[PDB]
Design a protein around this ligand. Structure first.
Ligand SMILES: CC(C)(COP(=O)(O)OP(=O)(O)OC[C@H]1O[C@@H](n2cnc3c(N)ncnc32)[C@H](O)[C@@H]1OP(=O)(O)O)[C@@H](O)C(=O)NCCC(=O)NCCS
Lengths: 408, 435, 435, 436
């Protein structure tokens, strides 16, 4: 399993290489245990080989409400969320217990290791003993949504509350809701890929199209993400997408983060220049030249709370010019580089910049530019529309700008 | 998976007991999944010898077997329960358990469960925590014994699940009523019920003491219930507690096929008890009746002749059986062990003691030998110096004269000058076997 | 093994540069018996970059592959020698070993050999020391050269005793005359023989200089002998020192099937170089010839159209090949790579560039692309904004403009003013492929 | 290593011989794995029982023990030389191998080398081929003997490389001069050189007849050289071939630490030889000198009292050593084995036989006991009934009478009337050690 020095060659797995060299709570919408046991199983098995310890929470599918509403015991939603009855425990018990063991077997029959924990975790307060027991043997802990009081009586508990408590106690890296409808929908009703809570939670709540169902579905996901490190994330895909949505570039599911406060200012004195200076020296090979910060004339500075990512804009013959874009390695891990770049370009639809031709960020610049002139040491990029005449001239000035860092 | 199996194979086949062990393993393969062995172990063992316990169990499972383990936690919940200021009431049963005690009982038995699972994995084994989900019980006692339960059904689902994954199933004695209510099961009935649902080949009680003791304070090697059980209950020497364990083991064995057995040892001895004929600890079987007679005509001589031929290698000399006189014959019902006496100048003389390896290991050789010496308090016999059985005879003898080829033993406390002449006679006897 | 394969294939089971690695891992399970790879390593690369060398070498193991490694003396044989006596040199190179200079060679090659074998093991791999017993040599006029030998036979017994063991044969250039007399053999003479006997699919040279530089001074990523050799020998900026290595390399590759290749890079990049189409370092192959013509009557339009359809997921629209007015067409003689150029308002215009991945992997796309841009120092062209070749195109462009669907590129000394219009005509040209 | 070392031990713990094997492992758990054993295999064995040889070696290797194996393809080479011809010359004391015979001594040895390496791998073991590089040698008598060498230096680099990786180093007796001249090494001078260099714990000689023989034709189970060597060397029955082996084995052992030992055995019995204190082989130690004396004042009684306290669990009753009247005393230099004889109504009566467990396993209990019974052909003694040394006592007696607390044994030609008498007396004797 020494699969870590083998991938220090490729593309995006270097960020899985700096967490594989440094786990995942899954809520399963029960409407999918009956559905695709084998595929949901293939997912959790794969999840382990890439060093995530699945801790799965499952309820009943419609298969349980229908077994109930056919025994003449309609549970209904109890005008709360769920789980109301007395005559129902035997059925709930056995419908959950069979489903639980079904999964433990499937995961194994898809290569992964597992552990049936039908009972003894949730109270009515978490006992993680059986969980850690499984984690300690590299086992997926499949947990049924069956709970008990202190004295031992069986009570049915709410998956949402069990998930919360479990996420609080474990501090998982990743939280995953597997649903049949894999992703939140935007305004058009398309698949809303990325939510940055603390840089778009305020808009989202006020937003008209955000019905009360998502309105508090998100207020909850926030409570989860708030109770975790910033490195954590809540994915929302579905079984047959899990792989692509956990670290890689595709994931046709939603990816909520907590994100951090963003500084956008035009006042150089409001910025910690030494923190920025360390950010640049750490992000690039070498440090800023002597007097660089002293001489700097800020147009806009975009700097995330933790000073691990920043874009400093200046003015070049009136054209917005990007003077500095610096992201620490383990903050590109949490999307900060992107949050900063995005906010910056929202500000500057027309933008000029340059990069040393052998800089590794160039692919990204090329991806992002609307035009580019290449030369032996330097490439100038732009976005926004403009005339051959204009750009020619501003591109000439950009190439003539004196270096802002020393060394190779 | 590849390194383990393979290297245990071309392993032990170079070890001392390796042959004997492969042979027990290969046979024990009446797998039916979790039909190998139910092992009871008290909490006092999980508390006083956890490394040892775990190792012994880990060994079984790395050698092919899949023990289902059931554990108590007496010392554990005596401590944890006094610490939480809750008194115990041993009313007409073994202890009432009121609502206030449950949380403690649940957590203490769950802790101990996990400890034992974890320890097994640390020993290199594979083990599943199953503190709940197997015993469904009725709560028949509510006012009288609180929350104690009688196992009404055994759900083996989790046991079967673990076994398939090749894990030892570690079960605690917590049950669930039919409505989901948590319940305390006493370890005796819990074991009875599991043993009845699994019908295992082997039941094993792991104790710190490691065996039942005879009248002399020695470990009683084996018990043949078909012959020894009456005697053992109507015996003044057998303490009240051992009487109970005896009647309980009887109860268990009665509800199993004839091929099953109970063993009683300590963890450190578990392997030698399971995989040697020798054993170590007490072995208990339902067993077979045994015939004592003075009449040769009521004996199956071709059946015996086969026993004698297989026990020693070479056969009986021609005319041996139609000429044999016969003072007394003691023959186990299956003809796999027999003692035949004749008379030597007036003395009782053991002319044949023949036991097949498997019967030796079941303890029928012992059984035949004991009923024989009860008959013949004074006894003469001989044996080749090569006979590996000589160690046993020496333990059993009251005297011995060794020679290059033969060794005369005698039993019964007469003196050297009194047997001197019958010893000379026994030496001069003709071989009763060819080769 | 069961904890190695399917996890490395399951990572590649659906990703990026993993459609092509899983492709290389499959080809590479072809004749594992050690016709896989001879890997020559400079004497120096085992002082400077020993841990990186090891880990590179070990990765190949964890992935199935069993390279035969040959190592030199270099900085070792120099220092350790002169610390006693004055060395000399008579033959073209082949140092010289008087006779009493041998004992040092043996122990020093052995040291380095074991040092390498240990370092690989420490890094997680499997290596066998084969400091001797593979090269059988002849003495070359003793009185002038001493104890330096020419390979007469190659014994592969100890090399297959690793191939069978899954370890990586680490070979020292030590030999023995037909009468056991230890002898010194020369590095790449020894490689020549090893390659001749094993006929590797791959022959890799490791150096601190991660490859071969070109006119500008970049790592020249590939050499197609059929079309590049003369060009490179008759070359100016190819210093005589580079010419030794091409002669040698051509030599080795002529003694190999057309599917083989040489690879000269740095240990850190060896994997990129072996398991990706783009590699990382200098790849050399015997290759294959190509046509450069401006007559459209001389091309197989049927063949080009099947390659375009195989290169992109779609075929040219009806009547394209009909009305195509070639300026220049550059076609590799297998037709697995091609560049076709038309004339756009007086500009040279790259109209089609098509390479099957196979040909991409083996440097034929580069060959075709280079002659083309040498013919057209000033080119215009476009590509779909989401085409992976855009990476290559950017590395090769002097300027670009990107809209949502198309991207226009150019080479040459033009600024945005001189090309503004033709770029605009290029964005407006019609598709030449189906949906 | 620590990862596999744990599991292998857990298994072995619950084996009958788990203890001793566990103990070899811990001994060699670190960075001297090649100092476990040098194993010499006779030419025959590779010819006849290759498959068993291989399985033996592969057993040791599977438990974590890396032998350093040396072979000299004897018989199969003899024939190979009868093949190409020119085979005879045995001038001095060794064979003489001329320039003509070399190219094929090589190929034969180098060949068996691979077969053995490959058998071990097949049998589930791990093994490195080391046919050349280790033995450096000065060429002996250029003329009279030819291309033969006396080892001058031992290069252990390759061996350590093998050990370090957990492979058994398989070494052929091919030498080479400092001027790189391949040469033929004598197999026994080869082992001596290697043993000197590695300072192994075990030196094993695998043979097909596996085990040395005594006068009566029985396997000679152990030799304690400090006390046995001289006798063995002057005994009529000890022949010339065997005398030669003892001479050589004594040299090996005089140059190793005290804890080292030589085993001579059959491949099929290797495990039982190293890991039990049984086995069909002969065990040989440098051993321990031993007094036999009638002189109580020449003995360290304090030490004997401590021997007695460890052997049995209690010290002698007050006044025992003061009162003692020694008939004859056999005490081993280290006081870990002792037999003390007294006089019982004139009969020789063994009053003490005390042997610590380690001494027993070294064969010192046998050294003392055998010397003692040589001196007292007629002997009476007693022993508590629950004494585990009783099985051995029975194996040694000519008769025995058993009672509840005690059992009286005797050896010697003795009439019923006699025995009865002295036996009655021995049962009556008072206990010599304070009670349990
Ligand atoms: C900017 C220039 C390169 C031309 O392009 P353009 O017409 O301005 O179009 P743009 O590139 O500005 O707009 C598209 C771009 O922004 C983005 N974009 C537009 N809508 C988007 C959306 N809904 N979601 C995500 N990205 C979007 C794209 O990602 C794209 O660039 P990309 O291909 O690198 O991904 C220009 O420098 C040029 O030379 N034009 C000259 C003007 C003229 O009229 N010339 C005629 C002769 S004088």
């Amino acid at each position: 399993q020494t699969i870590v020095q083998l991938l220090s060659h490729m593309r995006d797995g270097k960020e899985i290489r700096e967490y594989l060299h440094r786990f995942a709570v899954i809520k399963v919408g029960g409407a999918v245990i009956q559905d695709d046991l084998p595929g949901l199983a293939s997912a959790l098995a794969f999840l382990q080989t890439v060093g995530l310890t699945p801790v799965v929470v499952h309820g009943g599918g419609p298969q349980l409400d229908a077994a109930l509403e056919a025994a003449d015991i309609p549970t209904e939603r109890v005008d709360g969320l769920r789980v109301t009855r007395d005559e129902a425990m035997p059925i709930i018990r056995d419908t959950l217990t069979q489903a639980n063991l079904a999964l433990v077997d499937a995961i194994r029959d898809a290569g992964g290791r597992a552990a049936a924990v039908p009972r003894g975790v949730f109270e009515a307060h978490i006992h993680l003993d059986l969980v850690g027991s499984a984690a300690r043997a590299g086992q997926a802990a499949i947990l049924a949504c069956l709970g008990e009081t202190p004295d031992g009586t069986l009570v049915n508990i709410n998956a949402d509350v069990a998930v919360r408590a479990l996420v609080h106690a474990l501090q998982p890296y990743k939280v995953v809701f597997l649903t049949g409808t894999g992703g939140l929908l935007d305004e058009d009703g398309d698949i809303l890929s990325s939510i940055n809570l603390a840089t778009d939670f305020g808009d989202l709540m006020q937003a008209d199209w955000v019905n009360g169902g998502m309105r508090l579905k998100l207020e909850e996901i926030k409570r989860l993400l708030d109770d975790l490190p910033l490195s954590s994330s809540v994915s929302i895909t579905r079984p047959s997408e899990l792989a692509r949505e956990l670290f890689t570039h595709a994931g046709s599911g939603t990816l909520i983060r907590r994100g951090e406060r963003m500084v956008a200012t035009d006042d150089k004195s409001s910025l910690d220049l030494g923190r920025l200076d360390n950010l640049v020296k750490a992000a690039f090979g070498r440090p800023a030249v002597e007097g660089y910060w002293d001489r700097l004339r800020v147009d806009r500075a975009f700097v995330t709370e933790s000073y691990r990512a920043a874009a400093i804009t200046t003015r070049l013959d009136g054209w917005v010019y990007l003077d500095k874009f610096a992201v620490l390695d383990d903050a590109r891990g949490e999307g900060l580089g992107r949050t900063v770049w995005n906010r910056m370009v929202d500000y500057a639809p027309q933008l000029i910049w340059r990069s040393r031709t052998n800089n590794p960020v160039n692919g990204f610049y090329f991806e992002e530019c609307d035009g580019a002139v290449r030369r032996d040491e330097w490439t100038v990029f732009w976005r926004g529309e403009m005339g051959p005449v204009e750009v020619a001239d501003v591109v000439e000035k950009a190439f003539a700008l004196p270096p802002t860092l020393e060394a190779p």
